[PDB]
Amino acid sequence: MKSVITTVVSAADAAGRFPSNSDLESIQGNIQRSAARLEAAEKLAGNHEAVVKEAGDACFAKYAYLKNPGEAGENQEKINKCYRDVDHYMRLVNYCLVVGGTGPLDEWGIAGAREVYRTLNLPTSAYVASIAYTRDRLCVPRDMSAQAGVEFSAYLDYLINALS
Amino acid sequence: MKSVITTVVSAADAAGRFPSNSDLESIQGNIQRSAARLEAAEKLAGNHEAVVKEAGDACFAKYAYLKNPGEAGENQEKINKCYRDVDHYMRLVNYCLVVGGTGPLDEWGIAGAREVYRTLNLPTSAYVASIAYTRDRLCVPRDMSAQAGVEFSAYLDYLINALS
Amino acid sequence: MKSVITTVVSAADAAGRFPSNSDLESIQGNIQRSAARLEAAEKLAGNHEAVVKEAGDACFAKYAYLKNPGEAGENQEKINKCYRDVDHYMRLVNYCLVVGGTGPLDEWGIAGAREVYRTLNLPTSAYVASIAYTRDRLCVPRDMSAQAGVEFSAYLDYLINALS
Amino acid sequence: FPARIRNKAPAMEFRRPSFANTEDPSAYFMLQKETVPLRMALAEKLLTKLGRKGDG
Amino acid sequence: LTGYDSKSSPNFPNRAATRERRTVSFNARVARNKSQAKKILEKADEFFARSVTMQYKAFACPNGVYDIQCTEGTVKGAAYEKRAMAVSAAFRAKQASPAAKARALFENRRHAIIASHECQHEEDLFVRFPKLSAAYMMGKTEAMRTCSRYVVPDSLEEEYMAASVDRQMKERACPGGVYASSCVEGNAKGQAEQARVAALATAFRSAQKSASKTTAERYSSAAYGRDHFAHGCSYEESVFNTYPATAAAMRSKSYNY
Amino acid sequence: MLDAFSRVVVNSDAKAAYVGGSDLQALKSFIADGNKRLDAVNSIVSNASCMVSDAVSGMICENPGLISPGGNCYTNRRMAACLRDGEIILRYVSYALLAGDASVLEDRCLNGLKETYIALGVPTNSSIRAVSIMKAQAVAFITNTATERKMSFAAGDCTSLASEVASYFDRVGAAIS
Amino acid sequence: MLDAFSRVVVNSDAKAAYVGGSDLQALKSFIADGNKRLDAVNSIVSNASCMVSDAVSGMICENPGLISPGGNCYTNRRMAACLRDGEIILRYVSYALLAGDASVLEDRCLNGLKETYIALGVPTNSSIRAVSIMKAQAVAFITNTATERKMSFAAGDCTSLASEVASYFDRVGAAIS
Amino acid sequence: MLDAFSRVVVNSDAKAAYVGGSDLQALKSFIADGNKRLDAVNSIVSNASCMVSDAVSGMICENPGLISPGGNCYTNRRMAACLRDGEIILRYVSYALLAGDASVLEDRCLNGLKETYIALGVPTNSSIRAVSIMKAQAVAFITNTATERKMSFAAGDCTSLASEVASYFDRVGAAIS
Ligand SMILES: C=CC1=C(C)[C@@H](Cc2[nH]c(/C=C3N=C(/C=C4\NC(=O)[C@H](C)[C@H]4CC)C(C)=C\3CCC(=O)O)c(CCC(=O)O)c2C)NC1=O
Ligand SMILES: C=CC1=C(C)[C@@H](Cc2[nH]c(/C=C3N=C(/C=C4\NC(=O)[C@H](C)[C@H]4CC)C(C)=C\3CCC(=O)O)c(CCC(=O)O)c2C)NC1=O
Ligand SMILES: C=CC1=C(C)[C@@H](Cc2[nH]c(/C=C3N=C(/C=C4\NC(=O)[C@H](C)[C@H]4CC)C(C)=C\3CCC(=O)O)c(CCC(=O)O)c2C)NC1=O
Ligand SMILES: C=CC1=C(C)[C@@H](Cc2[nH]c(/C=C3N=C(/C=C4\NC(=O)[C@H](C)[C@H]4CC)C(C)=C\3CCC(=O)O)c(CCC(=O)O)c2C)NC1=O
Ligand SMILES: C=CC1=C(C)[C@@H](Cc2[nH]c(/C=C3N=C(/C=C4\NC(=O)[C@H](C)[C@H]4CC)C(C)=C\3CCC(=O)O)c(CCC(=O)O)c2C)NC1=O
Ligand SMILES: C=CC1=C(C)[C@@H](Cc2[nH]c(/C=C3N=C(/C=C4\NC(=O)[C@H](C)[C@H]4CC)C(C)=C\3CCC(=O)O)c(CCC(=O)O)c2C)NC1=O
Ligand SMILES: C=CC1=C(C)[C@@H](Cc2[nH]c(/C=C3N=C(/C=C4\NC(=O)[C@H](C)[C@H]4CC)C(C)=C\3CCC(=O)O)c(CCC(=O)O)c2C)NC1=O
Ligand SMILES: C=CC1=C(C)[C@@H](Cc2[nH]c(/C=C3N=C(/C=C4\NC(=O)[C@H](C)[C@H]4CC)C(C)=C\3CCC(=O)O)c(CCC(=O)O)c2C)NC1=O
Ligand SMILES: C=CC1=C(C)[C@@H](Cc2[nH]c(/C=C3N=C(/C=C4\NC(=O)[C@H](C)[C@H]4CC)C(C)=C\3CCC(=O)O)c(CCC(=O)O)c2C)NC1=O
Ligand SMILES: C=CC1=C(C)[C@@H](Cc2[nH]c(/C=C3N=C(/C=C4\NC(=O)[C@H](C)[C@H]4CC)C(C)=C\3CCC(=O)O)c(CCC(=O)O)c2C)NC1=O
Ligand SMILES: C=CC1=C(C)[C@@H](Cc2[nH]c(/C=C3N=C(/C=C4\NC(=O)[C@H](C)[C@H]4CC)C(C)=C\3CCC(=O)O)c(CCC(=O)O)c2C)NC1=O
Ligand SMILES: C=CC1=C(C)[C@@H](Cc2[nH]c(/C=C3N=C(/C=C4\NC(=O)[C@H](C)[C@H]4CC)C(C)=C\3CCC(=O)O)c(CCC(=O)O)c2C)NC1=O
Ligand SMILES: C=CC1=C(C)[C@@H](Cc2[nH]c(/C=C3N=C(/C=C4\NC(=O)[C@H](C)[C@H]4CC)C(C)=C\3CCC(=O)O)c(CCC(=O)O)c2C)NC1=O
Ligand SMILES: CCC1=C(C)[C@@H](CC2=N/C(=C\c3[nH]c(C[C@@H]4NC(=O)C(C)=C4CC)c(C)c3CCC(=O)O)C(CCC(=O)O)=C2C)NC1=O
C-alpha cells in the first residue's frame, strides 16, 4: 500500500540503512495534514447515502443509451448492480483519504481495471461522468473547507487520469 | 510478420538446424490454400470502397447516439475520420489474405489500438459493430467460393475476439 | 520430437495465444502427404525382415578388419547383436513416415550417438555403409510410387548427414 | 434469453411478379431481422374492449 | 535539372585517392565524413541500454513502493561493497577474449528474437544495436525471476538436480584446467568473503515470496527453458515441465559461467 | 442460399438482405414448390396483426379470468407483452416455413421458453390455448378457407404445406407443455 | 508434444515391433475427417471473446458470494487474474484438439494444479461449475444449434467431434481432485 | 523475418493501396513453382555434410598456407570452429530459398560479419572462394548435374532458380569483405 509512512520506510530497508532523520522529517509532514484531511473522510462517510443517488443518476443523464436494450444496462437488475459498482470507488476514497496515499486505489481500484472493462464491455467513459460530477458539484463554503477542496478534489483527479 | 512460412523458419532458426522436411509439408498446405485465399483478396481489391461505406452505416444505426456533442461523431471531419479508421482495417484484412497469416493485422492495426481508443474515448463496441455487419450479409455461394467465404470470414472475427 | 503439427503448436503457446488462420494452413499440407508417405511406411513394414540381413552383411562385406580378433566383432553373437543394431534404425525410420516429420529421428538416432560409438570404437563410417546400402537401391517405379520414392531416401540420408 | 437477444425476430416482405409466366424485375423479397416493439397503442383498445380497467 | 551540372559533394565519404599516401594521410582519408553517424549510433544504443533497464524496474517497484526484491543492503553499509563488485567486474568483462566478443553478440541476437514473440518492429531493433539485446535479456530474465537467486527448490531431490547441471554448466567457465578472468570473486583483501556475505542474504529473503509470487514464477521459468534449450527435446521437457528449478538455473547465454 | 438466409437471423446482430429479379429464379430452382411456398408464407405475414388479436382475445373469450386483478392479462403493459410475444412465434414459424425446417425455430425461440414462463407466472395451459388458435388460423389462410378475408392465388393444392405448418405449431406447444 | 499420429507410436516404442498395416487403418480414418477437425476448431477460435466472458458470469449468476467481502475474486487484482485463469485453459485445450490427445495439455499446464491452487486457497468447488459452462457451450458450437450465432459449414455428422471435447474437459476436474 | 509474401505487401504498404491483380499474378506464378521450390531446397539439405566438409579441404588444396604454422586454419580447433562456421551461412541461404526472400540471412548472419572477422584476423580472400566453391555445388543440385548423385525429378527447366541461388551467394561475400 502507498502512504507517507510505508513509502519512506521501504528505502530504509531496501538500501539497508537505519531509519534516518530525513524519514523522521517525513512523518512530521503527515501531522500537518492529519487534522486537515481526515475531516473529509468523516464528511463523506455520513454523506454517501444521498450522493450515491445523485452521482449515480449523473451518468445516465449523459448516457441514456445504457438503459437501452442490448447493452450493459439492459436490466433493472443491471442498474441495481451499477449503483453498487460506483459504491466501491468512493468507498475507497474513504479508505484513501484516511491513510494519506492512493494505496487503497492503486492496488484495489485501477490494478486490472482496464482488462475487466474491455472483456465485459463496461464503458469507462461513464465513470468519468459518475464521480467527476461530484467534482463539478463541490462547494467550498457550504460543504467542507478548502483543505478538503484541495485534497478530496485531488484524489478524484487521480482516478479520471487512471480510468482513461 | 506472423505467417506460416515465418513460424516454421523461426523454430528452424532457434534449433540451429537446417530446413527439415517437416516444414516442407506446411509449405505444401499453402499452395492448396493460396488459390482459395487470394481470390478472397482479389475480390476485396475491387469492392473496397463499396463495402466500407455500407459498413459504417450500421455503425450509426446500431448506435445512433454518437452524433451528440462530446461523442466521437459530432462534426463532419471526424465522421470522415471514422470511415478512414475503418478503411484502414479492411485494407489490413486485405493485406493478411495475400500473406496468408495474421501478420499485418496483429502488428500494424491491433498492437497498440487498445490504449489509444480508451485514451481518445473511442468505444470498441462500435468498431466491432462495423465489421460484424460486413461479415454477416455476404452469401457464401453468391460472391466467392465456399472456401474463401470460410477463410476470409475467419479473418474478420479475429478482430472481434481480439478487441473484446 | 518435432513433427509437422506438434511444432506449430509448440510455437503457438510460445507467444501465448490461440491458433491463427495460418496455423490451420500447415495442417492441410500433411493431409496432402498422408497418402504418398504412408505407402512408403508399408513398403518397409512388410519387408523389414528381408532387409535386416540384406544390408547387414553388406557392411561386413566392406570391412575385413572386423573379421579378425581385436574388435568387438569376433564371434557370432556379436554379429547376431549387430543385426539387432540394424533393427533399431529401421524401427524408428518407419515411425517418421507415420507422423510426417523428423520427430523420432533426432531423439534416439541422432542425439547422443557420438559417445557410444566413439568411446565404444564402433565406427560411424561402418554404419553409413549399410545406411547408404539401403539408399543406393531405390527402385522407384517398382517398390513404391514416384513421390514415395524421393522422400523415403530423404529420411534415409538424415543419419548420413548427422553421423557422418 | 439474454439481454441482447430478447424480442428479436425476422421480418419479411413479398412482392410477387405482375403477370403469370413472365419475368419481372420489380419482384423483390426482404428478409430483414427486426426487433418487435412493445406496441402499447393497440394494447389499450384490446383490454378495454374485453374486460375491465387493467390498472394494477 | 539544378545547375549546369551535378557534381558530387566534397562532404561525401570516400572521395580522395588513398593509393600511395602516408599512414597519417591514409587514415585521414578513409574516415573523411563517417565520424558523425558512428557517434550518433553509439549514443543511440547506449540510451536503449539505459531505457529497458528502467522499464523492468517498474515491475520491481509496483505503484511506488519497493518490494523485498530490491534489498541491496542487510547490515550497516552493505551496499558499498556491492557498489564496487558490480562496477569493477563490468570493466573485467570489457577486457575479455576476442572470441567471446562476437560470441556475446550473435547469441544476444539469438535469444532475444525468440523472447520477442513475433513483433517485427522489435527484431529490427535487436539486429542493429548489440547493447540493446544485452540489456533486453538481463532485464527481462530478472523481471521474471528466472536466473539463480529466486528459483529455490521445494523438494529434497531438486538440490542435486540444481547441483548436477551447474557444475556441468561451469564447463563454460573453465576453458581447461585453468580458470578465467570472467569468473572472479573480487580483488580486495575482504572482497572474496564480502561477495559471500551478500550471497547468502540475497538467497534467504528471496525465499520469502508470497504464494502468488512463487506460483507465477514456477511456470514462467518452465516455458523459459522450453523455448531456449529444449526446442524439441521432450526428455528435457519432461523435467522442465514439472521441475522448474531445473528449467531456470541453466542460463541461455554463454555467460562463461 | 438458405444458409446465407439463416445467417441473417442467427448471427445475433441485425443485418439486411434482399433478393432481386435474377436470384428469385435461384430460389425457385432451390426450394421445391416454392411458388406454392412463397404464396403460403405471404398469406401469414400479411394478416398477422389481425391474427395476434383474435388469438389473445379467444383466450379471454374462453378464459376470462386472465383479465381479472391478479391475472396475467391484467396491468396493460403485461397485456402488451402478450401481444409482443404472440407474433414472435408467428414471426418465427413463418421463418420455419421459409427455411423448410424448424431448427432455427427451436434454439432461438423455443429453447428456454418452458422455464421462462414458470419463472414469470405464465399459466401454461392458456399458452397452449393461444397457439392452438394460431395453428387453426394459419391453415385457414394457407388453404384460403378463411371466413372473413380471402386472398388471390393461382389455383392448385397447398395441403402439404398446411400439414407442414401444423408440424411447426405443436413444436411450440410441446415445448411449453 | 505428441499427437494422435504419435499416439500409436507411444505404443510402438514399447512393442519391440513396428506399426504398419496393422494400425494405419485407425490413422487412415483420422485423415478422412481431417478436414472436419480443422473445420471444428474454426468455431472455437471464432468466439474467443465470449467464451471466457460468459463462463465467469455463469457462476456469478449462480454462486454470487465469491465477490462478497471475504471473496477470492473480490477486487480487480483478483478477478482480472481470474479471466486469465479461465482463458489459458481454453488455450491448452485447443492445442489438444489439433493433436487428438491431451499430451499438450496434461504436461505443459495441468501437471499438478493441486500445489498451485490449494497453496493459494482457490475455491475448487465452483471451479468445476466454471468448467461445464464452457463445455456446454463447446458442444453447442460444434453443432450448429447455438441460439445466437449460426455458422455455415458443409453438412454431415460431428457427434464424434462433440463427444471428444466433453472428454477433454473431464480430466480437468480430475486434475483438481 | 520478411519472406516473399511479406515482401510484396511491405513495398505496397507505402503505396497506401490494396494488392490486386497487377502483381498477384507474379505471386500466383510463385506458388505455381512452389512445388518446384520444395523440389529445390530438398536438394540442398539432403547433401549438407558432404558439401560443408568439401570446401574446408578444397580451400586449402588451392592455398596450402592455411594449414601452415601460424595459419588461420592451422589447428584442430580453428578447423573445428571453421566447419561449424561452414554450414551456418548455408543453412541461412536454404531459409531464403524456402521463404523466397533474402531477408533472413542479411540480418542474422550478414549483420556485421565483416565487423567480427577483422576482430579475429579471419582472411577474406579465402572466405569468398570458400563460398563460391559451395555455390556451384548448389546450382548442380537444383539442376540435376551432379556427377555422383541423382535426384529423380520431373521434366522441366531449372534456370528459374539457377541464377537465383547464386544471387543468394554473391551478396554473401560482398557484404563480408
Ligand atoms: C469482396 C467482398 C464482398 C462481400 C462480402 C460482399 C458484400 C456486399 N454485398 C453487396 C450487395 C448486396 N448484398 C445483398 C445481400 C444478399 N444478397 C443475396 O442475394 C442474399 C439475399 C444476401 C446474402 C445471403 C443484396 C441483396 C445486395 C444488393 C443490394 C440490394 O439489392 O439490396 C455489396 C454492394 C455491391 C452492390 O452494389 O451490389 C457488397 C460490398 N460483396 C463484396 O464485394
Ligand atoms: C494504421 C491503422 C490506423 C488505424 C486503425 C487508425 C487508428 C486511429 N484513429 C484515430 C482517430 C479517430 N478514429 C475515429 C473513428 C471512430 N470513432 C467513431 O466514432 C467510430 C467508433 C469510429 C469510426 C467508425 C475518430 C472519430 C477519430 C478522431 C478522434 C480524435 O482525433 O480525437 C487516430 C488518431 C490520429 C488520427 O486522427 O488520424 C488513430 C491513430 N488510424 C490509423 O492510421
Ligand atoms: C538436465 C538437463 C539438460 C539440458 C537442458 C541439456 C542442456 C545441455 N545440452 C548439452 C548438449 C547438447 N544438447 C543437445 C540436445 C538434445 N540432444 C538430443 O538428442 C535431443 C534431441 C535434444 C534434447 C535432449 C545436443 C544435440 C547437444 C550436443 C551439442 C552441444 O554440445 O551443444 C549440454 C552439454 C553436454 C552435456 O550434456 O554434457 C548441456 C548442459 N542437457 C541436459 O543434460
Ligand atoms: C522397403 C525397401 C526395400 C527396397 C528398396 C528393396 C531393395 C531390395 N532389392 C532386392 C532385389 C533386387 N534388386 C534389384 C535392383 C533393381 N531392380 C530393378 O529393376 C532396378 C534396375 C534396380 C533398382 C534400382 C534386382 C534386379 C533384384 C533381384 C535380383 C537380384 O539382383 O538379386 C533385395 C533382395 C531381396 C529380393 O530378392 O528382393 C532388396 C532388399 N527391397 C525392400 O524391401
Ligand atoms: C428473442 C426471442 C424472444 C421470445 C421467444 C419472446 C419470449 C419472451 N417473453 C417474455 C415476456 C412475457 N411474455 C408474456 C406473455 C404471456 N403471458 C401470459 O400470461 C400469456 C399466456 C402470454 C400472452 C399471450 C408476458 C406477460 C411477459 C412479461 C412478464 C412480466 O412482465 O411479468 C420475455 C421477457 C424476458 C426477457 O426480456 O428476456 C421473453 C424473452 N420474446 C423475445 O424477445
Ligand atoms: C417472390 C414472390 C413470389 C410468390 C408469392 C409466388 C406467387 C406465385 N405463385 C405462382 C403459382 C402457384 N402458386 C400456388 C399456390 C397456391 N395456390 C393455391 O391454390 C393455394 C391456396 C396456394 C398455396 C398456399 C400454386 C398451386 C401455383 C401453381 C403451381 C406452381 O407454379 O407452383 C406463380 C406463377 C403464376 C403464373 O403462372 O403467372 C406466382 C408468381 N411466386 C413468387 O415468385
Ligand atoms: C555521390 C552521391 C551524393 C548524394 C546522394 C548527395 C548526398 C547528400 N545530401 C546532402 C543533403 C540533403 N539531401 C537532401 C535530400 C532529401 N531529403 C529529403 O527530405 C528527401 C528524402 C531527399 C530528396 C528528395 C536534403 C533535404 C539535404 C539537406 C541540405 C541542407 O541541409 O541544407 C548532403 C550534405 C550537403 C552537401 O554535402 O552538399 C550530401 C553529401 N550528395 C552526394 O555527393
Ligand atoms: C528500446 C527498445 C524497446 C523495444 C523493442 C520494446 C520491447 C518491449 N516491449 C515490451 C512490451 C510490449 N511490446 C508489445 C509489442 C508487441 N507485442 C505484441 O503482441 C506484438 C506482436 C508486438 C508489436 C508488433 C506489447 C503489446 C507490449 C505490452 C505487453 C507486454 O508487456 O508484453 C516491453 C516490456 C514493457 C515493460 O516492461 O513494461 C519491452 C522491453 N520496448 C522498448 O523499450
Ligand atoms: C370473444 C370471444 C372470441 C373468440 C372465441 C375468438 C373466435 C375464434 N376465431 C377463430 C378463427 C379464426 N380467426 C381468424 C383471424 C382472422 N380472420 C380474418 O380474416 C382476419 C384477417 C383475422 C383477424 C380477425 C381466422 C382466419 C380463423 C379461422 C377461420 C374462421 O373461423 O374465421 C378461432 C380459432 C379456431 C377455433 O375456434 O378453434 C377462435 C377461437 N375471438 C374472440 O374474440
Ligand atoms: C501455466 C499454468 C497456469 C495455470 C493453470 C493458471 C493457474 C493459476 N492461477 C493463479 C491465481 C488465481 N486464479 C484465480 C482464478 C479463480 N479463482 C477463483 O476464485 C475462481 C474459481 C477462478 C476464476 C474463475 C484467482 C482469483 C487468482 C489469484 C489472483 C491474485 O493472485 O491476485 C496462479 C498464481 C498467479 C498467476 O499465475 O495467475 C496460477 C499459477 N495460471 C498459470 O500460469
Ligand atoms: C486452413 C483452414 C481450414 C478450415 C477452416 C477448415 C475448413 C473446411 N471445412 C471443411 C468440411 C467439413 N466440415 C464439416 C463439419 C461440420 N459440418 C457440419 O454441418 C457440422 C456443424 C460440423 C461438424 C462439427 C463437415 C461435415 C465437412 C465436409 C467434409 C466431411 O464430411 O468429411 C472443408 C472441406 C471442404 C473442401 O475441402 O472442399 C474445409 C477446407 N479446413 C481447413 O483446412
Ligand atoms: C585441389 C583441391 C580440390 C578438392 C578437394 C576438390 C573439391 C571440390 N569440389 C568441387 C565441386 C563440387 N563438389 C560437389 C560436392 C559433392 N559432390 C558429390 O557428388 C557429393 C554429393 C558431394 C560431396 C559429399 C559438387 C556437387 C560439385 C560440383 C560438380 C563437380 O565439379 O564435382 C569444387 C569447386 C570447384 C570450383 O572452384 O569451381 C572443389 C574445390 N576439387 C579440388 O580442386
Ligand atoms: C513435402 C515435400 C515435397 C517435395 C520435395 C515436392 C515433391 C514434388 N515435386 C514435384 C514436381 C516437380 N519438380 C520439378 C523440379 C525439377 N525438375 C527438374 O527437371 C529439375 C531438376 C528440378 C527443378 C528444381 C518439376 C519441373 C516438377 C513438375 C511440376 C512443375 O513443373 O510445376 C511434385 C508434383 C509431381 C507429383 O505430384 O507427383 C511433387 C509432389 N513436393 C512436396 O510437397
Ligand atoms: C553499479 C554499482 C552500484 C549500485 C547497484 C548501487 C548500489 C546502491 N544502492 C543504494 C541505494 C538505494 N537503492 C535503492 C533501490 C534500488 N535502486 C534503484 O535504482 C532501483 C530501481 C532499486 C530497487 C531494485 C534505493 C531506493 C536507494 C536509496 C537511494 C534513493 O533512491 O533515494 C546505495 C546507497 C546506500 C547508502 O546510502 O549507504 C548504493 C551504494 N551503487 C553502485 O555504485
Side-chain angles (χ1 to χ4, degrees), chain H residues 33 36-37 39 142-144 153-163:
Chain H
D33 301 7
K36 322 157 49 180
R37 174 171 294 279
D39 273 320
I142 56 155
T143 84
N144 201 4
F153 288 142
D157 191 78
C158 276
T159 62
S160 184
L161 306 183
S163 64

Side-chain angles (χ1 to χ4, degrees), chain B residues 1-4 6-7 96 100-106 151 154-155 157-158 161, chain C residues 8-9 11-13 15-27, chain E residues 118, chain G residues 38 41-46 94-95 98:
Chain B
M1 291 276 103
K2 191 187 178 52
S3 181
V4 57
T6 50
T7 58
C96 70
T102 181
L105 262 183
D106 55 1
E151 185 68 28
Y155 280 105
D157 51 354
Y158 174 81
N161 52 14
Chain C
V8 305
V9 303
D13 57 341
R17 53 173 309 156
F18 281 176
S20 287
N21 295 117
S22 63
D23 193 12
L24 309 183
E25 284 212 15
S26 69
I27 319 171
Chain E
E118 295 94 12
Chain G
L38 269 72
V41 73
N42 215 34
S43 179
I44 306 300
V45 298
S46 191
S94 305
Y95 298 146
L98 278 307

Side-chain angles (χ1 to χ4, degrees), chain G residues 1-149 151-177:
Chain G
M1 188 178 176
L2 272 75
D3 299 328
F5 286 165
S6 282
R7 192 47 73 157
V8 306
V9 198
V10 173
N11 290 356
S12 202
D13 289 330
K15 284 182 186 292
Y18 301 175
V19 282
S22 62
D23 299 313
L24 57 81
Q25 65 274 1
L27 197 140
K28 182 66 72 175
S29 296
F30 186 46
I31 314 294
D33 302 328
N35 283 320
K36 271 171 48 169
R37 188 152 304 268
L38 269 72
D39 221 84
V41 73
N42 215 34
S43 179
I44 306 300
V45 298
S46 191
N47 44 19
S49 85
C50 198
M51 288 301 107
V52 72
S53 299
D54 51 17
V56 305
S57 72
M59 45 194 313
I60 292 300
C61 71
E62 279 147 41
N63 180 32
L66 295 147
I67 65 185
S68 64
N72 199 264
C73 56
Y74 192 49
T75 83
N76 272 355
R77 198 208 41 78
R78 318 178 161 206
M79 197 179 75
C82 169
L83 270 79
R84 86 175 312 277
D85 280 343
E87 193 272 332
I88 75 169
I89 65 170
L90 269 300
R91 181 177 55 85
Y92 267 126
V93 69
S94 305
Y95 298 146
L97 194 64
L98 278 307
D101 46 356
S103 178
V104 179
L105 170 134
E106 281 290 329
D107 307 312
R108 295 210 164 189
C109 78
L110 295 190
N111 50 11
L113 285 205
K114 293 284 100 178
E115 55 254 33
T116 184
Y117 272 169
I118 69 161
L120 264 54
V122 186
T124 316
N125 51 4
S126 291
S127 66
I128 41 156
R129 187 47 204 97
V131 170
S132 301
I133 177 73
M134 321 170 306
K135 189 171 66 173
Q137 295 181 6
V139 296
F141 275 101
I142 289 300
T143 81
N144 257 326
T145 48
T147 60
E148 309 193 354
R149 187 187 174 90
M151 285 309 296
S152 297
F153 298 138
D157 305 358
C158 294
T159 315
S160 293
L161 288 171
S163 177
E164 185 178 0
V165 292
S167 296
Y168 274 174
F169 285 139
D170 52 356
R171 49 185 63 247
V172 192
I176 58 191
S177 301

